[PDB]
Design a protein around this ligand. Structure first.
Ligand SMILES: [Ca+2]
Length: 260
């Protein structure tokens, strides 16, 4: 019974979560393609403030690179996270290969990055996120690693529909007008398959394309950070944004196991 030891930054408001950056100024360190084993390298974003934070790996999708998710990895790092936006070994890698590479990237932050990075990581509080096939990779890694603290598949694609063994808090963000990873064949079937008691939520962005995750988006930003705050940091000051959650508005649909 004490102040949460993982709490970082001020008491949140909607406007703070919708803004382009959080309260921590951030610096970058390259994970070189010439120095990364098991994935294609990346950019680590980390808070300049010397404290420990949660560590998060983020995969792009098919034909995508670290630059299509960089805004999100930066935005999230600036709320007090060490985040790596990766490149994949090839841009054509499939979901389950991306799951292995999200796994290699966490190992990287933890063992291979510079002292400044490693010193800011609480190695026991990790999370993954992914766009489309990166999103399928996130589900797979979440399924193989019950020890992760959260998983956030964004407009996810995967041929396997059944994610029955996931026990890691998972927010699946869907895009209502996605023409590539339709919520009806991908996001909803994945979400529908995760059984109680796993915490989870499904948010479907109103009016949004498959590519909404590759452009600065306050709804993806606010809800991704609330989710990582609530589950990587156990930070209950963020539950108020997720429960009861968005009226369905910027949001086509919201389902959740609130209050978690
Ligand atoms: Ca609508």
């Amino acid at each position: 019974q004490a102040a949460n030891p993982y709490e970082r930054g001020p008491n949140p408001t909607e406007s703070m979560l919708e803004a382009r950056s959080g309260p921590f100024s951030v610096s970058e360190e390259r994970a070189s393609r010439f120095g990364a084993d098991g994935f294609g390298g990346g950019t680590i974003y980390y808070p300049r403030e010397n404290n420990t934070y949660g560590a998060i790996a983020i995969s792009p999708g098919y034909t995508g690179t670290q630059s299509s998710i960089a805004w999100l990895g930066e935005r999230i790092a600036s709320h007090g996270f060490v985040v790596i936006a990766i490149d994949t070994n090839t841009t054509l890698d499939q979901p389950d290969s991306r799951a292995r590479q999200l796994n290699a990237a966490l190992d990287y932050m933890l063992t291979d990055a510079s002292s400044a990075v490693r010193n800011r990581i609480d190695a026991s509080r990790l999370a993954v996120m992914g766009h489309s096939m990166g999103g399928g990779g996130t589900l797979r890694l979440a399924s193989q690693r019950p020890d992760l603290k959260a998983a956030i598949p964004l407009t996810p694609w995967h041929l396997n529909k059944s994610w029955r063994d996931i026990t890691v808090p998972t927010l699946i963000i869907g895009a209502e007008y996605d023409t590539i990873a339709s919520v009806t064949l991908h996001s909803k079937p994945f979400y529908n398959s995760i059984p109680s008691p796993t915490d989870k939520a499904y948010l479907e962005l109103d009016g949004a394309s498959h590519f909404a995750p590759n452009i600065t988006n306050k709804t993806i930003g606010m809800y991704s950070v609330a989710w990582l705050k609530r589950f990587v940091d156990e930070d209950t000051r963020y539950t108020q944004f997720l429960c009861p959650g968005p009226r369905t508005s910027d949001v086509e649909e919201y389902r959740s196991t609130c209050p978690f």
